[PDB]
Amino acid sequence: ATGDERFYAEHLMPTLQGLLDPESAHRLAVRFTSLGLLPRARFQDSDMLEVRVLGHKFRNPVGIAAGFDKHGEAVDGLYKMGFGFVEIGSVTPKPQEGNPRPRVFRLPEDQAVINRYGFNSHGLSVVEHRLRARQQKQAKLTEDGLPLGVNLGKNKTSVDAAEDYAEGVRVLGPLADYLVVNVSSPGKAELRRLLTKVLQERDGLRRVHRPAVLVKIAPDLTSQDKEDIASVVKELGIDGLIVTNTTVSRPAGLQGALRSETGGLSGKPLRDLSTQTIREMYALTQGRVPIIGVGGVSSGQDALEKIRAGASLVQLYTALTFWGPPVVGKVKRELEALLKEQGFGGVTDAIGADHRR
Numbered sequence: 001a002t003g004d005e006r007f008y009a010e011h012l013m014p015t016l017q018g019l020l021d022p023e024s025a026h027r028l029a030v031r032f033t034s035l036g037l038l039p040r041a042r043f044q045d046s047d048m049l050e051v052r053v054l055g056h057k058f059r060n061p062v063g064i065a066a067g068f069d070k071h072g073e074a075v076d077g078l079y080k081m082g083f084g085f086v087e088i089g090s091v092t093p094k095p096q097e098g099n100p101r102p103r104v105f106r107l108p109e110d111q112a113v114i115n116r117y118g119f120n121s122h123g124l125s126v127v128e129h130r131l132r133a134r135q136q137k138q139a140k141l142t143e144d145g146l147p148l149g150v151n152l153g154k155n156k157t158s159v160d161a162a163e164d165y166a167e168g169v170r171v172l173g174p175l176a177d178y179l180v181v182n183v184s185s186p187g188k189a190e191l192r193r194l195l196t197k198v199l200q201e202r203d204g205l206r207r208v209h210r211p212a213v214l215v216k217i218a219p220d221l222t223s224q225d226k227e228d229i230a231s232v233v234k235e236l237g238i239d240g241l242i243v244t245n246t247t248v249s250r251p252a253g254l255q256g257a258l259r260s261e262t263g264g265l266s267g268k269p270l271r272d273l274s275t276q277t278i279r280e281m282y283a284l285t286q287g288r289v290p291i292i293g294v295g296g297v298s299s300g301q302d303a304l305e306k307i308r309a310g311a312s313l314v315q316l317y318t319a320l321t322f323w324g325p326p327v328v329g330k331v332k333r334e335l336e337a338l339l340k341e342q343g344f345g346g347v348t349d350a351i352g353a354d355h356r357r
């Protein structure tokens with residue numbers, strides 16, 4: 001319970017959110033982060049937070065989810081905040097503006113956000129050049145246990161999703177530790193086709209520049225959809241799953257005035273839907289496919305619940321928007337304390353632990 005955590009949560013963040021609409025705040029946050037104008041990250045990662053998965057070392061399991069740094073402008077500042085890994089994107093092949101404004105909405109009473117950004121993206125070429133500018137620094141960061149993920153999207157007007165994803169693999173795959181493709185509800189044959197093309201393109205990259213490939217799913221899938229995704233992921237040798245994206249559901253109980261805005265809902269109302277999706281996907285893949293768990297993480301308990309359900313790593317986004325940068329150290333500190341309290345030697349020993357009860 002540091003001075004910074006309390007000051008950010010009680011004074012600075014509510015003040016900024018009272019002055020700035022969420023898209024404006026998002027842009028300012030990216031700018032501050034890119035410049036390194038950050039509170040000091042006082043928490044030192046202990047050994048018990050280290051995870052080895054996806055072919056890499058992660059010095060802690062708490063990452064920044066896709067959609068915060070869409071265009072790769074703030075990667076170094078995000079490591080400076082204390083994140084164990086950074087995922088940029090989604091990046092589309094051509095630049096595109098996204099949906100008309102307003103397109104982001106806070107639900108403060110719910111600790112939630114709704115967004116319909118619509119894959120606003122600077123595009124592959126711009127992002128490729130930004131990452132190339134710091135490619136060696138990233139190599140050293142990855143070696144030191146701070147990997148980089150790149151989430152690949154598709155253009156609004158594209159007629160073949162597979163070709164958009166293949167272009168992203170070609171262009172940004174050599175700059176990433178892992179790539180992410182978002183999948184929505186089917187159909188199975190179409191998913192197999194798309195993922196086959198992505199994997200073939202990845203396998204064509206030189207070994208030292210060859211990333212892991214993960215599939216990111218929504219929580220809005222039928223049981224049949226989940227079954228089918230699990231089958232295809234195993235059949236094809238997909239390296240991992242990201243579980244989950246935002247939800248188009250609106251759980252009963254939402255209080256925010258903006259609850260009926262179109263878009264994806266994130267934060268606390270998504271938390272347990274995400275955790276249960278992790279549990280299901282872990283079981284459908286027999287615990288053999290690494291899962292990055294994401295949706296409503298703002299505490300050590302939230303992180304550990306996902307880890308015990310089957311996540312090897314977690315991400316957060318919405319909590320950063322409400323609590324600010326100190327939330328990263330908070331979640332790490334709390335997670336370490338809970339690991340110790342529950343008798344785990346480290347994160348690794350807790351992964352999927354609920355399934356062994």
Ligand SMILES: Cc1cc2nc3c(=O)[nH]c(=O)nc-3n(C[C@H](O)[C@H](O)[C@H](O)COP(=O)(O)O)c2cc1C
Nearest residue numbers: 065066067089090115245266267295296316317318
């Ligand atoms: C404003 C906003 C923009 C997002 N944009 C993307 C995106 O471009 N690609 C993506 O895969 N997920 C995106 N997401 C989803 C997040 O990566 C994450 O899966 C989701 O918000 C759940 O985590 P949270 O509850 O900790 O925010 C976005 C989320 C938010 C709130």
Ligand SMILES: O=C(Nc1c(F)c(F)c(-c2ccccc2)c(F)c1F)c1c(O)nn2ccccc12
Nearest residue numbers: 016022025026029032033037038320321324325
């Ligand atoms: O980014 C947002 N807020 C937001 C913000 F305003 C900030 F100043 C920071 C911030 C960043 C660096 C140093 C000090 C504060 C920060 F980390 C943030 F997260 C934001 C928000 O307030 N609502 N929102 C909704 C969707 C996406 C982002 C955001």
Ligand SMILES: O=C(O)c1cc(=O)[nH]c(=O)[nH]1
Nearest residue numbers: 116117118119120246264
């Ligand atoms: O750009 C967006 O609208 C977006 C993409 C995504 O994958 N998830 C989300 O919640 N928003």
Ligand SMILES: [Cl-]
Nearest residue numbers: 204205206207
């Ligand atoms: Cl070669």
Ligand SMILES: [Cl-]
Nearest residue numbers: 257258259260
């Ligand atoms: Cl309503």
